[PDB]
């Protein structure tokens, strides 16, 4: 399941989704933020098959660092790791109306491979700073 996968992720972002200061950004909290911008769904799934990099901030903090892709994972462990780590902290009860991560979201963005400084664009043209 979905926890399962996020042994994966534990080691940076940590048990409680909560990250590390300046090294891993929270996802307790912050998925819900990301979430609420339109393309912010697409946008979890890229990271995770393509990776990111660059310059951020996250909830006023800035990362300046970088995170593998994790294309190995099958689309539907991607699907459920992005369900976890939407609901495990409470991000998606912020969200009005939030559908579960499908399988099938995840193998259409895979058709269109993109570098992790392209993640970086997506993730500016979701209004983050
Ligand atoms: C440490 C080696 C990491 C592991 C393992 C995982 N992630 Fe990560 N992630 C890491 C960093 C350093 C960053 C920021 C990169 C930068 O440009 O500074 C991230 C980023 C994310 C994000 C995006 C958050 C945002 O505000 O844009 C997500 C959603 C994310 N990471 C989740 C995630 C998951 C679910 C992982 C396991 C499957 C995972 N990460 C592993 C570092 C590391």
């Known amino acids: 399941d979905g926890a399962k996968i996020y042994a994966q992720c534990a080691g940076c972002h940590q048990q409680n989704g909560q990250g590390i200061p300046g090294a891993f950004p929270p996802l307790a909290g912050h998925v819900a933020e990301i979430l609420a911008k339109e393309g912010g769904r697409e946008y979890l799934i890229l990271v995770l098959l393509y990776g990111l990099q660059g310059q951020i901030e996250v909830k006023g903090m800035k990362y300046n660092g970088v995170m ?34 499908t399988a099938e979201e995840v193998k259409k963005l895979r058709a269109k491979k993109l570098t992790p400084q392209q993640v970086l664009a997506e993730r500016k043209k979701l209004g983050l700073k």
């Open 68 to 101: 593998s892709s994790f294309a190995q994972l099958k689309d539907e462990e991607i699907a459920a790791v992005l369900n976890h780590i939407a609901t495990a902290w409470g991000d998606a009860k912020k969200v009005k109306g939030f559908k579960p991560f």
